[PDB]
UniProtKB/TrEMBL annotation, chain A:
The gene is cas10. This is Type III-B CRISPR-associated protein Cas10/Cmr2. Transmembrane segments: none annotated. The chain holds residues 401 to 599 of 600 of the full protein. Coiled coil: none annotated.
From TrEMBL, chain B:
Transmembrane segments: none annotated. Coiled coil: none annotated. Residues 77-312 form the CRISPR type III-associated protein domain. This is RAMP superfamily protein. Keywords: Antiviral defense. InterPro entries: CRISPR-assoc_prot_TM1791, RAMP_III_fam. GO terms for biological process: defense response to virus. The gene is cmr6. Pfam families: RAMPs (PF03787). It comes from the Bacteria. The keyword Nucleotide-binding does not apply.
From TrEMBL, chains C, D:
It comes from the Bacteria. Its main location: cytoplasm. One of its GO terms (cellular component) is cytoplasm. This is CRISPR type III-B/RAMP module-associated protein Cmr5. Keywords: Antiviral defense, Cytoplasm. It is found in: Cytoplasm. SUPFAM superfamilies: AF1862-like. The keyword Cytoplasm applies. Belongs to the CRISPR system Cmr5 family. Pfam families: Cas_Cmr5 (PF09701). GO terms for biological process: defense response to virus. InterPro entries: AF1862-like_dom_sf, CRISPR-assoc_prot_Cmr5. It comes from Bacteroides fragilis.
TrEMBL record, chains E, F:
The keyword Plastid does not apply. This is Type III-B CRISPR module RAMP protein Cmr4. It comes from the Bacteria. GO terms for biological process: defense response to virus. It comes from Bacteroides fragilis.
Amino acid sequence: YLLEMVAKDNLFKYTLSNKNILNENMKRFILKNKLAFSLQKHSGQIYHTAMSKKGKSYVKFNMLLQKYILKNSEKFLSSVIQMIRAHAEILQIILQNEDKRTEMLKNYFDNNFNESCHLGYTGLFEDIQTLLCLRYQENIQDYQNRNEIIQQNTILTSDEKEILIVSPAMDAIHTIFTALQFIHFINYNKD
Amino acid sequence: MPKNYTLQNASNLGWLFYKDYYRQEPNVDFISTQGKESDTTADFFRKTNQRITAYQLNSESPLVAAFNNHFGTPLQLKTIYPGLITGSGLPHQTGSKGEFKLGFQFDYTTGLPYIPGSSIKGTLRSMFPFSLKDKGSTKRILPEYRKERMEYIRDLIIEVTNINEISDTEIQALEYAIFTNSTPSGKTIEFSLEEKDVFYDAFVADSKDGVMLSDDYITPHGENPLKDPKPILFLKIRPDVTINFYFKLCTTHLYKEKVCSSKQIEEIKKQNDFSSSDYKMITAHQKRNLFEKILLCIGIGAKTNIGYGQLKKL
Amino acid sequence: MKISKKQIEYAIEALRANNIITNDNQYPKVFKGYISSFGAAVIQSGLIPAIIFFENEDNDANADRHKIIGVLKDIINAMRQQYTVTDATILVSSQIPANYSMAQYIIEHGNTDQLLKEITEAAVAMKLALRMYKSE
Amino acid sequence: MKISKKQIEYAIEALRANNIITNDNQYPKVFKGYISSFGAAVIQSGLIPAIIFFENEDNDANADRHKIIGVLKDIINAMRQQYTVTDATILVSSQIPANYSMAQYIIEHGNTDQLLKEITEAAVAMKLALRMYKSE
Amino acid sequence: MTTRMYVINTLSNMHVGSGEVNYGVIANLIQRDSVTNLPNINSSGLKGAIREYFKENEDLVRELFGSAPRDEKTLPGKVRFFEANLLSMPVRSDKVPFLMAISDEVLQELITKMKFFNCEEATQYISHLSTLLDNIKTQAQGTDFAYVFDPLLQGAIIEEVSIRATCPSHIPLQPSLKKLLGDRLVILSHKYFSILSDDNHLPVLSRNNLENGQSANLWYEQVLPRYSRLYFMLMDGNAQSEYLKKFRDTLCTPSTIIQIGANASIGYGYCQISELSPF
Amino acid sequence: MTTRMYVINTLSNMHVGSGEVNYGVIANLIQRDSVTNLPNINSSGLKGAIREYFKENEDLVRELFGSAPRDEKTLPGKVRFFEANLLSMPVRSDKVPFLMAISDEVLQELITKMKFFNCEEATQYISHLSTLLDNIKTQAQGTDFAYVFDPLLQGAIIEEVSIRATCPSHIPLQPSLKKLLGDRLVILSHKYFSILSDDNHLPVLSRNNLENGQSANLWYEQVLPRYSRLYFMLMDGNAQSEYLKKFRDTLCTPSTIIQIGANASIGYGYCQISELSPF
C-alpha cells in the first residue's frame, strides 16, 4: 500500500479514474519519486509520512537522521517532538506566512524552549526549521494547483475530495514530527 | 511601664504609638474641629507621648543579647544629635494638636525601634556606582552618577583593603556580587551558602543613661513668609544611643575583572597560569570596614540631608 | 479578598454623586493619592484615625478631601441595602444617616470588625473605580 | 483549553492592529510579562479588577500596557463575528463598541460567564501568538 | 522513628510570598492555608529552603531530598516535608511587650494532626492538650474568651481594646506545654484569633525604591511577625540512618539558622527548627 | 458482603494530575468526574496508591491487586476498585474555621449509588438520607438554600459564595450521617457547590524553581483542600477471606495513611480510609 497508493500517488489516479475524470489536465499533476514509510510500534500507533526524494528536503532529512541518531555526539531533545504535535496549527500559520516564514519559525522555536537547558540544542532547532521550510516549499510546489483544481471538480464527492486534498503545511509538519519520532525511537533504550 | 524596657513589664512601643495612641476616652474629643485643637486632647497626647518616651534599654538587655546570639557579632555605632528617623512616611496623623504627625519604624514583636535591613542595603548601595537603573528617565543623570560614585568607592577600597589598584569593571563586579549576589550582565555565579551578603535589621542596643525615644519639631515656614508656620511633631531616636548593625558578609574573590567563588578561586590558584596582579581579595572584615566608612560618611534614615541619623564610632 | 462588580458599580455611582467624577468622566489627579493614603492609614493607624483625618473639612488641602469619606458612606449604604434577612440578624443592615458623622457612627457602634471589612471593601472599590477613569 | 487556530489568527491581526508589533516583527519585551500576568490577575483577583488594572493609562509602566486590552477587545469582537446565530445559542454575538471601554462593557452587560470565557481564551491566544515575534 | 513534629521559631520577620495580585493596600501578601486561612509555609518552599541549607553535602541532599532539576537521572525524594501550619503568633499588649497567641481551634487542629500522624512523643502531648481544651471549653461556656496562665497578665489588652485577658484559676499550664506554645501564652476564641490574624491586622512593612535619592516606587509588604511558631511534620521514608541522623543533628542544633521565604538579602525569614521535646 | 463503601479523609492537600495541557494560568489541573465535573480520584490512581502501600506484603498484592507490570506470568486482580467521587469539601467560614459542604445533588448521587451497588449498610443509610433530602426539598421549596444542623452555626458565611447558612429546625441530622458526611456540615444547592468547586475557587498554589537564587520556571498548581472527603466502592471478586480480612484491617486501621496523587515528597495527598459504619 505504501509503495503503490502513497509513494506512487496511485490514490489520486485510481480515485479519479474510477469516476472517469482522469483527463490530461489532472494527469500532469501526478507526482512520483516519493518515499513512504510507516512505523507501527507494539501497541498500534502508526507513524506514517511521505516525502519527495527530489530536492533538498530528502538530503536534509538524511543528514538529520545521521546527525541525531546515537552511535553505539550531538544531543537530542525529546520535548520538541510534542511541541511539533501540539503546536501544529500555529506552525501551519507560521509556514503559510510567506514573507517572514523563516524569521517567524526561528522566533517561535526560540520563544518556546527559552530556558537554560535549550542552549545546547540550537543545532537541532535550526535543522528542524530548515527541514520544515524546505518540506513546506516542496509541498506547495507539488500540491497547490492540484488541490485547487480538485476542489473545483464538479463530480467528486466530499469524502473523495477530503481524502485527496493534501494540506501543504500540515503534511510537512507531520513529516518533521515522524522524522523526530523515528530518531527518538532509535535512540531511546528501555534501560 | 516606666523605664527599663524589658520582656516582663513594658508596653509594646509600636502598639502604644500606633494602636493605643488614638484610643477613645470618656472625655476626650478629636473628631470635631474644636476637639482636635482643645487642650484636653493636647494633654491626652502629651501623656501618651510621655509614656512612649519614658523607656530605657540596658546594655545587657536580654532582647539585644538574643539579637547578638542570632545575628552574630554587632557593629556598634552612636547617634549624633539631629536624632535618628526611620519609617517617616508611614501614615500617622489625625489633624490633632500634640500628636506625632510622622510615622516611626517599630519592630512588631519586640517593639524596639529598628532600621529594616532593606534601608541599610539601599543606603549602602546608594554610594555605589551601579545603584541607578538605566530606564530612560535616568539617562541624563546616569553618566555623572557612576563617575563620582566610582571615584568615591575606589578611594574607599584602596583605603580599607591592601589593594593598590582597582578598575571600573572590578568595581562593577564587586558591587553586583555584594548586593545582587550575581554578575553585572544577568547570569548568576555558583556561590556557597556562606558566600552571601545578608543585611539584617539594625536595632537599638543601649540607651546608656536616658530614654531611647525623643520628640522633635520640624517647622516648615511657608513659601509665603507672611503666614503662620506649621509646627510638626515627630518621634526620633535619642542622640548617644548604641545602634547595633548586624551583617552576614563573606570574602569576595576577584580574579581578572570577574568575581570568583572560593571553589573556583582554589582551582584558579592551582592552575599553572596565575597572576597575583589579577587576583584581588576583599575580606569580610574589610567589607565591614567599608560599610562602616560608608555609614559614617552618609548615615542612615530619613532627613539625612538635614543631618538626621549620622554616626560616630563607639 | 475579591471586589465584586456590584461594589464597583456602587463606587462609580458614589463618585459621580459626591461630585468627584466630572460630567466629562474626569477627576482631579489628587484623589487617587487621597484614596491610596486612606488605605495605608486604615491599615497602619486604624479606622478611627484614618476616618478622622479624611473626614476633616478644615484642611487647606488642594481639593475637597471629605468627598472620599462621603463616597465611602454611599458605598457602605448601597452595600447594606442589599443585605438579606439571614445577614441582617448577624450584620448591622441599618442605613448610615446622611448627616451623621462617619467617625462618630463607627465610635458609637463600637469598633466592630464588620465596619472595618466594609470600609476596606469600599476603599478598594474606590481605588479600582478611580482607575477606571481619566485623570485631568 | 486546546489551541484554537482561528483565535490565534485573530490575536495576530489584533496585535498588528493595536500597534504592538513593529514593521520589523518585534515588540517591546515587557508585553510578554503583561500577557502572562493578565491571566493570573483574572483568575486570582477577578475579571473586573484585572481589566481595570490593565486598561488604566495613568500607569508607571515601561510601555503602553493598555494596548493589550484593545487587542483583547479586538479578539473578542472577532469571535463575536463567525458566531452561529440561532435561537438556542447562549452566546451573544453583539460587538463591543469602540467608544466603550472594556471595563464599562462588562459592568453594563452583566452576563460575565460568556465574557469571562471569551477573555480567558483570548488571553491564551494572545500569549501563544506573541511567541511568533522577536522579544526585543 | 517515622513521623516527627518540628517547631519553627522565626528569628526575624518571615515573608513566604503567595502568588497573588492584591489591588488594595498590601501589594505582597503571605501564603495562607487553603482551609483555615492561617499563615503557613508551603511544603515546597520549606523543602527548598532546607535543601538549600544542605546543598554542600551532595550525598545527604541526594539521598534525602532527591535529585537536582537538571540531571539525567531523577531520584525520588525519601524524606517527606509537610506544610508548616501556624502555631503561635506574637500579639502586642500593654502589660507585656508580646504574648504568644493560640486559638482553641488551632489547638484542636494540633490535637487532630498529632492523632492522625502519630508523632514520636504524641501521646502525652495529646492527653494534656486535650485536658486543657476541655477545661477551657468548660470555663468559656460558649462566650468569647482570652485566657492567660500568669495572674500578673490580667486585664492585658491583646492587640485590641475589645480583647481583654482574664486568668481562669482552674486550668494548669504544664511546663512542657509552655515550652511548646511559648512563654507568655494567651488562648483566644476563634473569633478573636481570626480578627487578630486577618489581612487587616497582620504586621505590614512599607518599602520604596529610590532613584538618585528620589522615590520611584512604593509598596507595602505583609510579614509574619518575629518569633512566630509554626509546626510541620517530617516523615522519614526508607532513608539511610546515617544521613537521617546527620540531617536531624544539623537541623536541631542551636547554631543552625535556615532562611525560609523571600527577601533573604534584607533579613526576612531566618528560622530555628526544634524537634518535639519529650513531655 | 461484596460491595463496601470506603470514605477517604484527606489529611493534606491532594493533587491528582489529569495530564491535560491547559495553556492557561493553571498548567497542572486536578482530575474531575466525567459526568458531574466534580474533583475525583481515578480508580487507577487509587489502586496504584493502595498497591504501593501494600508492596511489602508481596503475597497480598499478588492475590488482590494482581501481578506486577513486569512478570512472566499475568494474574488478574480480584478486588474491584471504583473511582473516588467527592463527598464533602471544606469551605471557608467565619463562625468556624471551615464547614463541610455537600450539595443536594451529591446526596442524590450517593443515594443512587447505594441503591445500585447495595453497599453493606446501604438500607438504613438510604432510608435516612432520603428522609433528609425530602425534608430539605420541602423546606427549600425550589429556592437556593444553605442549611446547617447545629443551631450555633446559624448565619455562618461561605466566603467564596457570599451567602449565610440558615437553620431549618424541622430537619434532624442523625449521628451516623454526621460521621459519614463530616462535622460542621452545610447542605446547599447545586449552583452553590458548583461555584465552590470550580477551577476559579479551588486552592491554586504558585510554585517556582530557583537556580543559584534566580527563578528558572513558574507554574500554578491547583489542589483539593485538606480534610476533603471522598467515597468509593470496593467489590471483592473470589478473593481469599484471609487476605481480604488482612486488607480491610490494615486499610481501616487508624495508624494507616495512604498517599494518593502527586507531590509525595512535599506531603500531598495523605489520606485515611474508613469503612461504612453500621447505622
